[PDB]
Design a protein around this ligand. Structure first.
Ligand code: CLA
Ligand code: CLA
Ligand code: CLA
Ligand code: CLA
Ligand code: CLA
Ligand code: CLA
Ligand code: CLA
Ligand SMILES: CCCCCCCCCCCCCCCCCC(=O)OC[C@H](COP(=O)(O)O)OC(=O)CCCCCCCCCCCCCCCCC
Ligand SMILES: CC1=C[C@H](O)CC(C)(C)[C@H]1/C=C/C(C)=C/C=C/C(C)=C/C=C/C=C(C)/C=C/C=C(C)/C=C/C1=C(C)C[C@H](O)CC1(C)C
Ligand SMILES: CC1=C[C@H](O)CC(C)(C)[C@H]1/C=C/C(C)=C/C=C/C(C)=C/C=C/C=C(C)/C=C/C=C(C)/C=C/C1=C(C)C[C@H](O)CC1(C)C
Ligand SMILES: CC1=C[C@H](O)CC(C)(C)[C@H]1/C=C/C(C)=C/C=C/C(C)=C/C=C/C=C(C)/C=C/C=C(C)/C=C/C1=C(C)C[C@H](O)CC1(C)C
Lengths: 41, 160, 231, 227, 74, 221
């Protein structure tokens, strides 16, 4: 699975998974914390 | 069907037809089995999976299936050179075709009978779609009046 | 050959030429395969034997002199002359002392044969688990076959105590009362008579000891070991 | 060897005719392993002798007590009473369970090691002289009918055992199909053989769908699904 | 559409088909005898559109597909 | 050589699944443990999954037996809400965080054993937590931990064939219990009752109570 994990470590797979997890994290942030116009603490 | 026509079994001959035996529930159902057809198919799938997968691996390796334990049943799974003809202690229990020419003749017997049966199975399916009756019933109706009861004479009433 | 738990079979590996008394080539699970574990298990077996002997004898004598009292509930209904919390604390302290001394003897023999009070009094050198000396005043003959007698009576008494608690849980009465209940009706008082499971129905004898018993304000969940798994 | 179970069957290599009952069978190949082969011979001997006892019991019970069907003879209400003790089926099961557990553990230890449990557990001076496995003798052979010709008597025993096994399978199937006794079924076949045969009789399970035995429900069955 | 019969039971027997298209009462007999004009209820040729839906006549599409299938197999 | 997961058939994966590991029958059709480091990691995962599923299945079976006996014991699929209703003073986040922290302590101990097989038998822990090795030829650490604490009865110290037999027992029972928990989850999803309830329902009625009669597996019957 060394070659398979090397394929998973290739630049397109890693950038698509990274933008996927970042977009999903931001989406769930807006799902639980919607309409956050300002950083009101 | 030939047993229901003679009345030996207590099954109505319209019910003892092969495609009404629960193989196709739209075509007919037999609800008197000891389980419903899906449970029977589940255990049949398991059993056929066993049998056909061991057969497949013996085809791929024509010496295997006798080296791994199988509750002592692996002794009769050696087979022979031909995958179609294992003929061990079980597959040829009566030991017929002792001499090679008799074995070839009986092989020809088997293949001719089986190809006739392949034609017969295709014909039984076509008659079942064609006449909505059993193959023995179709044979009896054809023997009653061959000119009227044939493929061209039954061409009008086919699924009714 | 020799005395065996299963005649015609052989001893295992760790039990070949036993030095422990009452060795009959058992241990199917091989619990005594290890060396020091076998000695620890021998000590635990000896103290189990002696404690269960004391327990079975105490239950029997308590019933002979007092047939009206139930030994399983005797800890809650006996009318103690003293309070129970201080009694339990006294027992905990003194039994902690004596069991610590015994356990450290088993850890190392030549370490505590000495009286902490009087320097002159000291147990002689002995095999571990068999103190003797003051503990063994009078000995009816040689020590080895009497040790075998002791261990065999201890196995019998452990089985006896398990039978006692199961008779108390199933019948709700005394084991000699359960005995006299079994003798007059031998075909009907067996557990096979009163407990049969078949693929379709399970018959379980009812539990007689109450699930919750009140004792000095508090309640103790002294049910009936565990149900469900009862046959 | 000589004559086999089929006119043209080739005998197995391990079936050389050396031991009793060899007719060159085993199409499953279950006898290929000699260890399992001795185990299966032990099972065959036990099953054959128990089938003999069962078939002889059914026949003798039918000729002596014809009013009691052997299939339902295990019911508590059909059990003949010899004393004033109440009938309790766990009581009988305890006696048999303990006694048969003892004797079958003895036989199992004899199977595991040849010459293992031959001696009496109390005095190890007098033993049973078993010549091979499954054939203890001694008190089990007190009338001295062995000693001389042992192979033909062994084959007599094994062939009668196979016959008794087949006969008890017949008895069970006939009891489930007709609901009547075996000799009674034979008598019924002598009267009207054209209606009292395996045709029509099969496909009906005369066994009730359950049974109640002093508060215990046993579901029962009839070997084949046919009612 | 809930009470419309399922496609298989329309395919299963020619009875309901004969209620909707009467040429199915005689089955495949006029096909093999080349009296194909009796199939004109469901093998049609009008042109234009079905006024109920505004689409083509589905019988015309059937006739089209059969004709081009014969042409392509030739 | 050994008995395989598919008798005959010599395309069994190259010599990383040789007949050395306990439970090895050549079953890796997807090659999920082809590399040796992943193979060792997956051996740790398999042993841990087997032990955890064995504990969980034993607990589920005992609580389901007690539930049929009339005890005040909930079924496994509803024990959390039953505990919260019986004990309202416990915060769910409280118990969850406490479980996370305590489980994390021992799991980081196991993790640093995975990273270094000999690094956990020193420091605060004694030499008994060094481990005994086994998989991949090493004689330290790994899923098998000897000592008088994780093997207090000492049933794999002495007689190596006894150790091999017990290891085979453990791996077979662990795989069986993993499939048992999978069956428990599937039966709860398809029936809505407990495992012992399903077992006695099928034993009481062999027929008409199979998986095709629950309406979930076969989705029309
Ligand atoms: C650079 C230009 C820019 C800027 C400054 C913003 C700023 C903002 N946008 Mg916006 N947006 C933009 C471009 C921009 N956007 C574009 C181009 C589009 C079209 C796709 C949108 C479409 C859009 C939508 C549909 C919404 C916003 C929303 C928001 C607000 C949400 C803040 C938040 O997510 O919580 C805080 C986030 C965090 C604390 C996470 C930070 C840490 C992360 C995990 C690190 C990520 C690593 C990389 C915020 C003020 C939301 C809103 O409600 O507006 C008020 C919303 O609904 N935006
Ligand atoms: C009439 C059809 C037919 C014929 C002529 C043959 C002929 C042959 N088969 Mg074959 N076979 C058939 C049908 C047939 N088979 C079917 C339908 C199946 C599927 C179940 C098989 C499956 C099969 C296997 C797996 C094997 C053979 C083998 C063989 C060869 C071994 C010699 C032999 O015993 O002959 C057969 C003799 C006859 C067909 C005549 C007897 C006909 C009677 C009336 C039927 C007997 C059934 C009996 C009543 C049921 C109990 C049997 C017994 C316990 C009494 C031989 C050339 C073996 C082989 O290849 O050897 C190397 C072997 O491996 N066959
Ligand atoms: C907890 C009490 C106890 C303990 C510590 C021992 C310990 C020992 N026994 Mg012993 N034994 C006991 C009770 C006990 N026994 C009882 C009650 C009987 C009568 C049935 C016997 C009969 C017996 C025989 C015939 C022999 C031994 C022998 C031995 C020694 C070797 C076996 C071994 O290494 O495994 C160690 C055993 C344990 C660590 C006990 C583990 C208990 C498990 C974990 C609980 C399971 C309980 C089990 C299911 C039974 C349920 C109880 C009840 C319903 C009956 C060993 C030092 C052999 C020997 O060489 O003598 C010196 C031997 O010949 N025992
Ligand atoms: C449980 C009964 C039983 C057992 C354990 C055996 C065991 C044995 N038999 Mg035997 N046999 C039996 C019954 C039995 N037999 C019966 C009833 C008959 C009369 C038909 C025979 C006739 C017979 C012959 C002629 C020969 C053997 C031989 C052998 C030996 C080699 C065969 C083998 O290895 O397969 C092992 C067999 C089994 C493990 C039994 C499996 C039973 C299956 C699983 C159930 C099948 C159900 C069955 C078809 C239905 C029966 C009822 C029916 C009558 C309606 C072996 C030790 C050979 C021999 O003597 O070796 C020297 C041989 O020559 N047997
Ligand atoms: C060998 C093919 C075969 C198969 C697959 C079946 C299958 C079936 N039969 Mg049947 N039967 C057969 C042959 C067969 N039969 C023959 C040759 C006869 C004439 C004696 C009968 C006479 C018969 C009757 C009277 C009845 C059945 C019934 C049934 C159904 C219930 C099972 C039962 O109790 O019957 C019995 C099982 C057998 C007869 C098997 C013996 C056949 C050979 C010897 C072994 C194979 C079942 C689906 C019952 C039914 O219709 O359900 C309501 C029923 O009452 N059968
Ligand atoms: C998550 C539990 C788990 C894990 C980590 C392992 C790990 C391992 N197994 Mg094992 N196994 C398991 C469960 C597990 N097994 C169960 C439950 C069974 C009984 C069916 C078996 C039966 C088995 C056999 C017979 C053998 C192995 C073998 C192996 C080793 C080599 C295979 C491999 O590298 O693939 C790695 C495995 C995984 C990465 C886990 C697979 C999970 C997949 C990705 C999810 C899909 C599977 C799931 C069942 C589908 C349903 C999920 C959901 C829809 C409900 C390896 C260390 C071989 C060996 O050599 O033993 C040492 C071998 O012979 N296993
Ligand atoms: C990691 C093992 C594990 C598993 C397999 C389960 C499984 C389950 N839990 Mg649970 N739980 C766990 C750990 C676990 N829990 C822990 C550590 C705690 C904190 C002590 C809780 C506290 C808890 C509460 C308070 C409740 C459950 C409930 C449930 C059931 C339904 C939950 C649901 O519908 O969503 C699906 C659940 C999953 C898909 C589990 C996957 C996630 C883990 C990490 C694997 C379910 C069968 C509920 C219940 O009682 O049912 C009525 C309930 O409310 N659990
Ligand atoms: C998800 C798939 C990820 C599989 C992990 C990587 C596979 C590596 C491997 O198997 O070794 C190659 C392995 C050869 O061994 P090598 O020497 O490591 O190359 O190939 C095989 O023998 C098995 C290949 C099977 C791959 C399965 C693909 C997915 C099947 C899904 C079916 C639908
Ligand atoms: C292997 C072995 C080995 C050992 O050792 C020995 C032994 C045992 C001998 C063996 C076995 C064998 C076997 C099994 C056999 C069988 C066979 C068969 C079944 C055949 C059939 C076969 C069959 C066949 C051909 C069939 C055919 C059929 C036909 C033509 C039909 C016809 C028809 C049709 C169309 C329809 C119509 O409407 C009517 C009719 C007229 C009716
Ligand atoms: C050997 C072996 C080895 C292998 O390998 C494995 C196995 C098999 C597991 C094993 C084992 C087995 C067994 C059987 C065991 C058991 C044990 C026991 C029983 C103990 C008890 C033991 C027991 C015991 C101590 C007991 C004791 C008791 C007591 C004191 C009592 C007391 C009392 C009294 C007086 C009276 C009062 O009022 C109350 C009370 C308080 C109640
Ligand atoms: C040879 C071979 C080999 C190859 O390889 C494979 C094959 C082919 C499979 C084969 C075959 C096999 C077979 C046939 C088997 C069979 C068996 C049997 C039948 C058994 C029984 C067996 C049987 C038996 C034991 C039985 C017994 C019986 C009894 C005890 C009874 C009892 C009784 C009586 C008195 C009466 C009362 O009232 C009740 C009761 C209680 C009821």
């Amino acid at each position: 699975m060394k070659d398979f994990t090397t394929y998973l470590s290739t630049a397109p797979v890693l950038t698509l998974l990274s933008v996927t997890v970042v977009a999903g994290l931001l989406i769930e942030i807006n799902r639980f914390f919607p309409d956050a116009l300002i950083a009101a603490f | 069907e030939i047993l229901a026509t003679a009345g030996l079994i207590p099954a109505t001959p319209e019910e003892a037809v092969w495609f009404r035996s629960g193989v196709i529930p739209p075509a007919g159902q037999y609800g008197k089995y000891w389980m419903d057809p899906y449970s029977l198919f589940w255990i049949e799938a398991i059993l056929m999976n066993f049998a056909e997968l061991k057969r497949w691996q013996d085809f791929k390796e024509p010496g295997s299936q006798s080296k791994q334990y199988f509750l002592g049943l692996e002794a009769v799974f050696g087979g022979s050179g031909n995958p179609a003809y294992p003929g061990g202690q079980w597959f040829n229990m009566l030991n017929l075709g002792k001499t090679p020419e008799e074995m070839k003749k009986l092989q020809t017997n088997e293949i001719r009978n089986g190809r006739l049966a392949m034609i017969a199975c295709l014909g039984c399916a076509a008659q079942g779609v064609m006449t909505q009756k059993g193959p023995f019933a179709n044979l009896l109706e054809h023997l009653a009046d061959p000119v009227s009861n044939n493929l061209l004479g039954n061409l009008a009433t086919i699924l009714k | 050959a020799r005395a065996n738990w299963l005649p015609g079979s052989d001893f295992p590996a760790h039990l070949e030429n036993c030095k422990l008394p009452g060795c009959y080539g058992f241990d199917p699970l091989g619990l005594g395969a290890n060396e020091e574990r076998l000695a620890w298990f021998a000590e635990s077996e000896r103290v189990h034997c002696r404690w269960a002997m004391l327990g079975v004898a105490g239950i029997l004598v308590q019933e002979i002199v007092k047939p009206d009292v139930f030994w399983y509930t005797s800890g809650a209904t006996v009318e103690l002359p003293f309070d129970i919390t201080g009694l339990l604390a006294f027992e905990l302290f003194v039994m902690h002392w004596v069991e610590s001394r015994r356990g450290y003897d088993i850890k190392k023999p030549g370490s505590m044969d000495q009286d902490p009070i009087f320097s002159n009094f000291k147990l002689p050198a002995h095999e571990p688990g068999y103190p003797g000396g003051i503990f063994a005043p009078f000995v009816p003959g040689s020590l080895e076959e009497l040790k075998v007698k002791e261990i065999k009576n201890g196995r019998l008494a452990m089985l006896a105590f398990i039978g006692f608690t199961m008779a108390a849980q199933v019948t709700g009465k005394n084991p000699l009362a359960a005995l006299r209940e079994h003798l007059d009706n031998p075909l009907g008082t067996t557990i096979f008579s009163k407990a049969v499971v078949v693929p379709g129905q399970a018959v379980v004898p009812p539990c007689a000891i109450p699930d919750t018993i009140e004792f000095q304000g508090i309640t103790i969940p002294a049910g009936c070991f565990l149900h469900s798994l009862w046959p | 060897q000589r004559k086999l179970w089929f006119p043209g069957v080739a005998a197995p290599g391990y079936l050389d005719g050396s031991m009793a009952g060899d007719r060159g069978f085993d199409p499953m190949g279950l006898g290929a392993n000699p260890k399992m082969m001795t185990w299966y011979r032990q099972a065959e001997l036990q099953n054959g002798r128990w089938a003999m006892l069962g078939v002889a019991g059914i026949l003798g019970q039918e000729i002596i007590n014809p009013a009691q069907w052997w299939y339902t003879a295990g019911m508590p209400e059909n059990l003949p009473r010899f004393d004033s003790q109440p009938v309790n089926m766990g009581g009988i099961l305890a006696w048999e369970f303990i006694l048969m557990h003892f004797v079958e553990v003895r036989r199992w230890q004899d199977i595991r090691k040849k010459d293992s449990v031959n001696a009496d557990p109390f005095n190890p001076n007098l033993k049973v002289p078993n010549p091979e496995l499954g054939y203890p003798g001694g008190p089990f052979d007190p009338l001295g009918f062995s000693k001389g010709n042992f192979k033909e008597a062994q084959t007599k025993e094994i062939k009668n055992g196979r016959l008794a096994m087949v006969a008890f399978a017949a008895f069970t199937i006939q009891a489930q199909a007709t609901g009547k006794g075996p000799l009674q079924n034979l008598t019924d076949h002598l009267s009207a053989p054209f209606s009292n045969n395996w045709t029509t009789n099969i496909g009906h399970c005369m066994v009730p769908t359950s049974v109640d035995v002093q508060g215990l429900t046993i579901p029962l069955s009839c070997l084949w699904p046919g009612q | 559409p809930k009470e419309i019969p399922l496609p298989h039971e329309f395919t299963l027997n020619p009875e309901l088909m004969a209620q909707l298209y009467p040429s199915f009462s005689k089955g495949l007999a006029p096909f093999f005898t080349l009296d194909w004009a009796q199939y004109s209820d469901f093998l049609t040729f009008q042109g234009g559109l079905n006024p109920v839906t505004g689409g083509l006549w589905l019988t015309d599409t059937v006739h089209h597909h059969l004709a081009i299938a014969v042409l392509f197999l030739i | 050589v050994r008995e395989l997961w598919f008798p005959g058939n010599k395309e069994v994966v190259p010599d990383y699944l040789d007949g050395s590991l306990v439970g090895d029958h050549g079953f890796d059709p997807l090659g999920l443990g082809s590399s040796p480091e992943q193979l060792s990691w997956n051996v740790h995962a398999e042993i841990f999954h087997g032990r955890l599923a064995m504990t969980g299945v034993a607990g589920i079976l005992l609580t389901s037996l007690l539930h049929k006996g009339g005890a005040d014991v909930p079924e496994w699929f509803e024990a959390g809400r039953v505990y919260l209703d019986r004990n309202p003073n416990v915060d769910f986040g409280a118990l969850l965080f406490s479980t996370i922290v305590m489980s994390g302590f021992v799991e980081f101990k196991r993790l640093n054993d995975i990273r270094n097989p000999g690094s956990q038998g020193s420091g605060i822990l004694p030499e008994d937590f060094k481990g005994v090795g086994g998989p991949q030829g090493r004689t330290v650490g790994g899923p098998y931990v000897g000592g008088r604490y994780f093997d207090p009865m000492g049933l794999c110290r002495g007689s190596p064939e006894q150790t091999l037999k017990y290891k085979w027992n453990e791996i077979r029972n662990g795989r069986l219990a993993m499939m048992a928990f999978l069956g428990f989850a599937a039966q709860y999803a398809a029936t809505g009752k407990g495992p012992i309830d399903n077992l006695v329902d099928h034993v009481a009625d062999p027929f008409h109570t199979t998986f095709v009669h629950n309406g979930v597996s076969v989705p029309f019957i």
